[PDB]
Amino acid sequence: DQICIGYHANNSTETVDTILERNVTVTHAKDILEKTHNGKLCKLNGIPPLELGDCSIAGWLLGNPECDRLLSVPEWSYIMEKENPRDGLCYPGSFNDYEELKHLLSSVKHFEKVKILPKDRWTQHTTTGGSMACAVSGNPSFFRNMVWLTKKGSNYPVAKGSYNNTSGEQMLIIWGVHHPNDETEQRTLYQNVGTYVSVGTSTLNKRSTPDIATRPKVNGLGSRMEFSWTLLDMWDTINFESTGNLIAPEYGFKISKRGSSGIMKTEGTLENCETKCQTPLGAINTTLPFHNVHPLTIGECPKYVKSEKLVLATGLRNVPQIAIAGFIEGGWQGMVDGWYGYHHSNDQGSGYAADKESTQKAFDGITNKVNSVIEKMNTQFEAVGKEFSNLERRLENLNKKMEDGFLDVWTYNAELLVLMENERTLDFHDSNVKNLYDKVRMQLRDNVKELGNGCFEFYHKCDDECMNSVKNGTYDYPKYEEESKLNR
Amino acid sequence: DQICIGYHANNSTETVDTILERNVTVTHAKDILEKTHNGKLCKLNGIPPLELGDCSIAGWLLGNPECDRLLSVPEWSYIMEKENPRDGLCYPGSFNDYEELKHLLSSVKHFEKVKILPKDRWTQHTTTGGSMACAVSGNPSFFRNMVWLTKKGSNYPVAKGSYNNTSGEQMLIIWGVHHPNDETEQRTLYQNVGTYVSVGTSTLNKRSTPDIATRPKVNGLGSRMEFSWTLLDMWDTINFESTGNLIAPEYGFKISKRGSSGIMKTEGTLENCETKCQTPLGAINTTLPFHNVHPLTIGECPKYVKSEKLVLATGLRNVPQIAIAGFIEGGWQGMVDGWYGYHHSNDQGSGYAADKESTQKAFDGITNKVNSVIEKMNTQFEAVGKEFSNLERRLENLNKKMEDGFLDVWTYNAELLVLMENERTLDFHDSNVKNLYDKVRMQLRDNVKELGNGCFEFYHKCDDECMNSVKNGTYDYPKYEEESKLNR
Amino acid sequence: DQICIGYHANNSTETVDTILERNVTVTHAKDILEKTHNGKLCKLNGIPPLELGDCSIAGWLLGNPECDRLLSVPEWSYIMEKENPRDGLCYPGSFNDYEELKHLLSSVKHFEKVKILPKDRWTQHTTTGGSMACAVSGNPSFFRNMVWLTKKGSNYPVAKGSYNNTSGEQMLIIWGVHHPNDETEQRTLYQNVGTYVSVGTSTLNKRSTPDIATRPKVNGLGSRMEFSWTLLDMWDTINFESTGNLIAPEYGFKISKRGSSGIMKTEGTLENCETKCQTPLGAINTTLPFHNVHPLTIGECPKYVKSEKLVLATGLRNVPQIAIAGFIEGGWQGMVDGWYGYHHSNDQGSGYAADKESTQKAFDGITNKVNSVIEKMNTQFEAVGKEFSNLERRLENLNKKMEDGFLDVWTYNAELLVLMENERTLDFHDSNVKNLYDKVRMQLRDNVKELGNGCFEFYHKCDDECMNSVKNGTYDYPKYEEESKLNR
Ligand SMILES: *[C@@H]1O[C@H](CO)[C@@H](O)[C@H](O)[C@H]1NC(C)=O
Ligand SMILES: *[C@@H]1O[C@H](CO)[C@@H](O)[C@H](O)[C@H]1NC(C)=O
Ligand SMILES: *[C@@H]1O[C@H](CO)[C@@H](O)[C@H](O)[C@H]1NC(C)=O
Ligand SMILES: *[C@@H]1O[C@H](CO)[C@@H](O)[C@H](O)[C@H]1NC(C)=O
Ligand SMILES: *[C@@H]1O[C@H](CO)[C@@H](O)[C@H](O)[C@H]1NC(C)=O
Ligand SMILES: *[C@@H]1O[C@H](CO)[C@@H](O)[C@H](O)[C@H]1NC(C)=O
């Protein structure tokens, strides 16, 4: 009569890496890294994005004639923009604090256009000026949301205009200053030399003077237009005054909604979907702590790591080979009912089994360790990504270094944690079998002999009741002791 | 006669968490996280703070008439400032590079005030200007550290003034420029149109021109005052020149004491206690390495972590179940001297005893582990807190991201380290008791029988000396060899 | 006959550290921290650095007459600059966006000077101006790369000049503006009052006006010169227009070679040596994953840490004390050909031995462990170092805190890794010894007699062949069953 102690084997081919060994085959393993996406630009939480197309943010806000589909935009989840958009400032020039405006737009999620300075209030000036650089069907035209003020007859009176913010929320207002190319242009347009543009609010006070100089021709013109912006608080007034060279606004943008959005640089087009995490390469759907798709993401994206594989072992070391022997020379292939167990062979018959308590304890411990690895990762809405001008390179380098350093730290953490946990799991699984063997030996004592392969041979003829007794942990030594002596 | 080996149990209810199990009761534990404070603001290292009250930094430095209690301030340890102070710039305007000034103030103490340009030197101008914005007792007044120069009679000559820094340290100087509301006011005050203000040092060169424009009324006025500041090096000269619109300084601030300080944003007052660490919610008096009261802190203080429980296990599991059995069926409450020990039952009596060597070894190891975890964290004077303007949102976001990332990293590190160390300790203890059992078994050999519960049964008569020898490592096996053979 | 199981010992003094113990003497160790340099400034990958001597970047680019040895420089790997260079701006003044220019130079490895505006083209002005501040041999002189335009006769016509970038790469152009002291100087030099300097490209539009004011004398002059720089893209035109106070450029710097570089702040001199990693104190020659020489490296260098000692244990603990005993009493000094082995004393002499499979497995495990710890850290060209102005203190503090936090995190990670792995390996060796002893005991069974010191005493007479069979896992129990049963 024999009883053996051993573990379970199967036909798995998964491998994990420990700190002491490489490419160790295991019976059960879990991949905790997702590497797949659907390659589609999709709607986030049921709200479609704002597809700018070939239009920049400045072109959309200023009302470029080639972005006329954006004159009334609904609520959006994020903004899709191209790397080098073609339809921006049709009239050459510059935009002050452009990156700050984009950062502000990264948390807006909806706008409302309000007419604040109607084009017909300027009864002493000409408000029908246009340039060929913003042409529409071969005729001169200008930005849709702005007004160009020009002399009426041969006079340019002082132009004054004010607006009191009764809309109900904060407002964004954009104005501009025109820089001519020569004195003749200035005289033709405004009749005066030495002009100014003054803008004033409760917390803003700005005065500007045009610069007249010859410049290289961009879009055919040597002139430039410089645009500025401000945020008007509730129940506040904005004042305008100019003796020339003022591109006054006609509309203001009220911030209706507010939340978590972003500007993502892609060249794609929207297609029907419904997602939660969006990447400039596609959409994601998983539950694992890490991925390796793209650093700059938007949504419920778990964590970006610079690693190609992260597999956690939750099963046995797969040694296939097994007068059935025990755990000295490998596991068993026919015991598909659990992790650890016993094998008995008496006159009635042979058969496998499983130790329920030890298997359940190991299962609970392994599951708790896996859930501790996965569950302790703090996740928040991080629409990372910022833009800097060409006069701010130290800031850009600082941001890049910060992101790369954090990425390296988390990659190192993931790798070392996975390796160390794999080694402890594989050691603990063998310690459990050793403890089972030790407990059986201690509760059996001298009525049995050891064959050295993990099995015990019985001096006393053991029936299935005795097998259940030893497996159950209730063995009465002073019953067969007298009988076991005689045959020993 | 019997000897048994087992561990020690008590009535503790403390609970620790491991990477494999939750809610595990232990005999001893150590808390390394501070979660309490005083609720009070008081002195740091014997030096009281500077309580601004309803005053701002600019209001204190410029001499707001409502802040006259701060005309002479002794040495301070830190500055207490409200979130939205009421008494700042009584005359509406702006302050250039305000946040840089606050950052400089985060490392300065005392600020001895010296008179650089006496008010009576301006013999060719009028120095008694005032406004109803800064009104005392119903009469017009002005800032106490500045001079408002106006026309004497009907003339405003060129105003010139210089100072040489022969004080002994760096000096902070503030000057302003007036922006009127209309040309009539400019003519009434300064009699000229087309004025300028020029300030120059060996490293500075600034020229300003007034701006005349209608503006929304703040504090009843449509005019503004713009202030700028500079740091004057030792043995350096500052030159002033103005045809009009100059607010000259009368006093300069000398940096007397330099050190580690900060600005605390609180709405509370100062009470009479003393501490070596201060948080906006209260003071921390502790020696523990961590705390979770508040991120922003001033003084030498423990690190901050976003956790609610950090407990180190320093003792065995509390399994209280107890012919007395051994370690296999749980611990003993009869052991009141050590962690691992013995129990003997001879014919002269019985009782409990402790093994001093193993207990001392395990105690030293656990103390080393605790001190290694605690002492491998470096803390210094960390003044978390900085101010940013409206047009610096990207920098504020960068600062917030950096702080949050580092705090998250350290919280993760502390939690995982505590979990792993707790699991290691719980395995250390049972390894130690098993080692003691195996040592005694090897020393005793075939003179005894193993009962399967951690107890031995002797084949001879173990008196007090015999049992003491077993407890000492000096068991003389050959003495009782032949005797034990007969009984077997 | 008698066979014992033990481990190897020697006369090593090296001590490693664990989390439970300190100063543990081990047989073999491995230091993964580098602490030595050569105290020399050397050539990086065979390319010598650019030695500025006592000059600054501004003095070299502007053409300081005291920096005439740098009028034509070859390729370089990095730039060596003093903390406080003596020869910078000989004429007192400032330099707009100086730190940005230095950061740009941190990624440029060569320049090619191109003559864009020849000095003889100004046929309507005088181009022979100089000052005694930039004096050569007692005569007035000026910057070598700049032209000082001055009235010819009694006239200063409008000065116009343009350049089209057909060189083949981006070009760096520097111009300047002169600020006189009094009006008499302005009339003497330029004949006009109310002048302007206009500079314009496709993306740049700048206009400046001279400031005339009395200022403290620096280098004997109250006048100043303000310098600005720009980057001209390929096939782009720059325009200069001025009615006075223009310091025109004569040369343009074309970016010939690009790469990863930096600026080293040192007071030393280049020596005749090569290197691959360079620190301000000296070069580093190592193949290790850590160092503590200097953080401001330039090149492919190991990671910096504030650790003073990082030693991994690769061998066994040193317990040097041993008829012959086994592994309980201590280590063996005689055994030299392995880690775990035997000792046999039969009738044909005596001697030690060394198990092969166990030593091979342990050696492979430790090798994989050290390789995993070392080859997990990413090292690339990370030449660090940035400059900030006196009005950018918040940015400087931000950068410093970022670097300090990252380095503290990495130091913690390295220390924890080494401290935990040392415990793991020191327990691994003991487990291996015990497993070998248990395997021998299990395959020997009842024919032997354990003595409690790690040694098995035989019953039947066993020759060298039988012991060799025992050591090779082929001992036949049935062969000696009859003889063993008799003596037992
Ligand atoms: C492990 O297996 C992979 C293939 O699955 C192979 O690329 C790699 O080199 C192997 N590593 C070792 C150490 O054998
Ligand atoms: C702007 O409108 C609000 C509400 O209608 C009013 O209280 C406020 O006085 C107005 N502003 C001015 C400058 O009149
Ligand atoms: C006991 O553990 C469970 C998780 O298994 C946890 O939810 C519970 O809070 C713990 N008990 C206490 C008192 O916290
Ligand atoms: C300022 O005073 C110091 C001595 O206190 C003197 O050396 C220096 O020349 C003075 N400054 C000027 C501009 O004269
Ligand atoms: C027990 O060991 C101690 C060791 O200090 C020794 O002094 C004492 O004599 C020993 N007693 C016996 C009975 O062996
Ligand atoms: C370990 O050795 C170092 C010097 O090698 C010494 O400074 C330290 O105090 C020692 N520690 C202990 C616990 O002996």
Ligand SMILES: *[C@@H]1O[C@H](CO)[C@@H](O)[C@H](O)[C@H]1NC(C)=O
């Ligand atoms: C500059 O040179 C390029 C190439 O020769 C030419 O295409 C371009 O038109 C030139 N610029 C101007 C303004 O003529």
Ligand SMILES: *[C@@H]1O[C@H](CO)[C@@H](O)[C@H](O)[C@H]1NC(C)=O
């Ligand atoms: C650097 O170290 C290597 C050993 O790996 C040695 O061969 C070489 O000569 C050393 N070079 C210098 C410059 O010290």
Ligand SMILES: *[C@@H]1O[C@H](CO)[C@@H](O)[C@H](O)[C@H]1NC(C)=O
């Ligand atoms: C082990 O060595 C013995 C010599 O005693 C030899 O007879 C046997 O074949 C060897 N076995 C193996 C597997 O090398």
